[PDB]
Amino acid sequence: EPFFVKFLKSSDNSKCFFKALESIKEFQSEEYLQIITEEEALKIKENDRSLYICDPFSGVVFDHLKKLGCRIVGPQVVIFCMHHQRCVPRAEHPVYNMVMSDVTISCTSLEKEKREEVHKYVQMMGGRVYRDLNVSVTHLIAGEVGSKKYLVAANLKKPILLPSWIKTLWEKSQEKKITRYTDINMEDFKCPIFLGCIICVTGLCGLDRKEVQQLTVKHGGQYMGQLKMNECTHLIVQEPKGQKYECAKRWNVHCVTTQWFFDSIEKGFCQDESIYKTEPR
């Protein structure tokens, strides 16, 4: 169980850094423990394959150690591992803490930029990233609804959460409020059933029209009174006929039956449009 470590001592550090120094001393002999001055650290030109520990993941020294490929982890990682009696992680990427330690996420319907931001957070918290979905994926970060991946996840009945969940976990992490992803409520971050949809309706009685209107707003979607191109995503129609229908069909907009809208709210996620196509043929 012993492992070779190097602590980096600066002036600013630290609250946890010193909890770590001690925690390790009670765990193993100093033979495995080295303490490095920022000067000493900068001289290193080779990856010892040792374990380096830095409290601030931003700094001239950090950048150097990271560029080399060294294994860097935050003090909170050591404390976490010591207390849970589980081995420290191998740091292909620097791991600041273990809040997200046993979780493996996936992403869909996110701006490439947003995706990368989430990945950096998940990685720095002891989590992994799995683009393709299989048994091992535990959570799906979704920016919107509709993709195949989104549908496969909903079928496997896996938690479909917003990027805010990750941002929250991270932010509540720096600030000493939380130590585990389970400490907050996933429920409050569920991806709205119609998030991303812009729904229009036709041929429904005023009562029904007003119902889908407020149910849409209640589930993250946007309601539009009229069908405008480059603005409407779904047009709820019962049958393949009418001037409005033919126009939506012309714009390549989804024409679906009410069955789609209400089954979505029933099942708890946005249904596949192919199953509810207004047009049979």
Q: Per the structure block, which two tokens stand in for 205?
A: 């009685």
What's the domain range around 164? 96-193
Cβ-based neighbours of 35, under 8 Å, separated by 6 or more = 6, 7, 9
273 CA to centre of own chain: 25
Q: Determine the Cα–Cα distance for residues 266 and 168; give it in Å rounded to an integer.
A: 28
The full length of the chain comes to 281
Does one domain contain both 173 and 248? no
How many domains does the chain divide into?
Answer: 3
End-to-end, the C-alpha distance of the chain in Å comes to 65
Does one domain contain both 139 and 181? yes
**Domain end position, chosen among 140, 167, 193:** 193
Q: What is the CATH number of the domain that holds 207?
A: 3.40.50.10190
| Residue among 68, 78, 75 at smallest CA distance from 41 | 68
Q: Per the structure block, which two tokens stand in for 150?
A: 């989104």
CA-to-CA separations, 186 to 18, 114, 195, in angstroms, rounded? 33, 20, 17
Does one domain contain both 100 and 188? yes
| Residue among 118, 157, 166 at smallest CA distance from 138 | 157
Does one domain contain both 131 and 100? yes
Report residue 29: phi and psi, to 5°: -75, 155
Please, how many CA atoms are within 13 Å of residue 36, restricted to the half-sphere of its CB? 19
Does one domain contain both 58 and 73? yes
How many CB atoms are closer than 10 A to CB 149? 17
Does one domain contain both 65 and 116? no
| Residue among 277, 263, 280, 276 at smallest CA distance from 154 | 263
**Domain end position, chosen among 66, 95, 124:** 95
Does one domain contain both 77 and 10? yes
Q: Determine the Cα–Cα distance for residues 61 and 37; give it in Å rounded to an integer.
A: 10
Does one domain contain both 72 and 134? no
How many CB atoms are closer than 10 A to CB 25? 11
Burial class (CB in 10 A: 0-12, 13-18, 19+), 169: buried
Q: Cβ(223)–Cβ(217) under 8 Å?
A: yes
Contacts 24+ apart (CB under 8 A), 40-49: 41/8, 41/65, 44/68, 44/70, 48/4, 48/6
Measured at the CA of 134, the angle between CA 131 and CA 136, to 5 degrees, comes to 90
Does one domain contain both 165 and 155? yes
Does one domain contain both 91 and 102? no
Q: Per the structure block, which two tokens stand in for 83?
A: 């207390």
SS (H, E, C) the chain: CCCCEEEEECCCCCCHHHHHHHHHHCCCCHHHEEEEEHHHHHHCCCCCCCEEECCCCCCHHHHHHHHHCCEEECHHHHHHHHHHCCCCCCCCCCECCCCCCCCEEEEECCCHHHHHHHHHHHHHCCCEECCCCCCCCCEEEECCCCCHHHHHHHHCCCCEECHHHHHHHHHHHHCCCCCCHHHCCHHHHECCCCCCCEEEECCCCHHHHHHHHHHHHHCCCEECCCCCCCCCCEEECCCCCCHHHHHHHHCCCEEECHHHHHHHHHHCCCCCHHHHECCCC
Does one domain contain both 77 and 3? yes
Does one domain contain both 5 and 90? yes
CA-to-CA separations, 196 to 68, 133, 199, 220, 279, in angstroms, rounded? 42, 22, 10, 7, 23
**Domain end position, chosen among 95, 112, 143:** 95
Q: Cβ(11)–Cβ(59) under 8 Å?
A: no
